[PDB]
Amino acid sequence: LAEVQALETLLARELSVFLTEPTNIINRITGKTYALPSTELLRFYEHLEQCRKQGALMYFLERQGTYSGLMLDYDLKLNTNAAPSLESSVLSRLCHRIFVHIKNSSVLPEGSHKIHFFFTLKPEAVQGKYGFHVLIPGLKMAASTKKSIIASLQHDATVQKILHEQGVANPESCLDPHSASVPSLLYGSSKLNHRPYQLKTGFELVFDSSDPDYIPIHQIKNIESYNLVSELSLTNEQGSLVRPVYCAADIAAEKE
């Protein structure tokens, strides 16, 4: 733990400079809030990944803010008491359905862009409920656009059919309706009494405004070869694999 303590004091000395005053990151272990600029987020995520690779206990939260990446928090009750299979072919269709509502939102920028979907599930169940996040960290959109996509996915009959076929006993009440507001847990961190979400697989989706009908979805190879906490952050913009796709958003109106 010696090398973990060295990083913990390093984080404390590098983030104390950004202590909130009369907010994007919360350290629930220490109860201190910080206002980090985007230029300094990559160094922060670089230090967390070091602590993650050593199994350090951390509990950092990331406020989704008004304009950031999209997260979908599912809390599913399964037909059996075992964790969901979540085969790659099933999650690929989920990506397609999620993207159909993204394209229909009319916020995507012009040109060719790479979208990355990430699926992390909770290791153990809480109150008989299993959960998994669908992180689209590089695709930055407004909070209202997230509520539109979330509301559409709640009524998406195709998504409900897939979940029910996988054994989900609550396909209509599993998607958190407040997914656009809850802070995103950084990858390696979790509550003291709960295990951290583990990344199963990610998918790469290439989209071109020229040909909108061609939507190839391929699985990501060597995801663990990247700074996972940085690639999965909804507010990171300096990732290597995940490159930001800035969607249309009225910044000020979205805050008001």
Residue numbers in the entry: 21 to 42, 47 to 280
Give the article text:
The N-terminal AEP domain is responsible for the DNA polymerization activity, whereas the DNA unwinding activity is catalyzed by the central SF3 helicase domain. The middle PriCT2 and D5_N domains and the C-terminal Tail domain all contribute to the DNA unwinding activity of C962R. C962R preferentially works on forked DNA, and likely functions in Base-excision repair (BER) or other repair pathway in ASFV.
One apo-form structure was solved and refined up to 2.6-Å resolution, showing that the AEP domain is composed of two subdomains: ModN (aa 1–90) and ModC (aa 91–285). In the AEP domain structure, the Met1-Tyr20 region is disordered. However, the region Asp10-Tyr20 is well ordered in the full-length C962R structure, folding into one α-helix (α1) and forming extensive hydrophobic interactions with the D5_N domains. The Ala273-Ala285 region forms one helix in the AEP domain structure, but is disordered in the full-length C962R structure. The Leu21-Val37 region folds into one helix (α2) in the apo-form AEP structure, but it is disordered in the binary and ternary structures of the AEP domain. The apo-AEP structure was solved by molecular replacement (MR) method using the model predicted by AlphaFold2 and the Phaser program of the CCP4 suite.
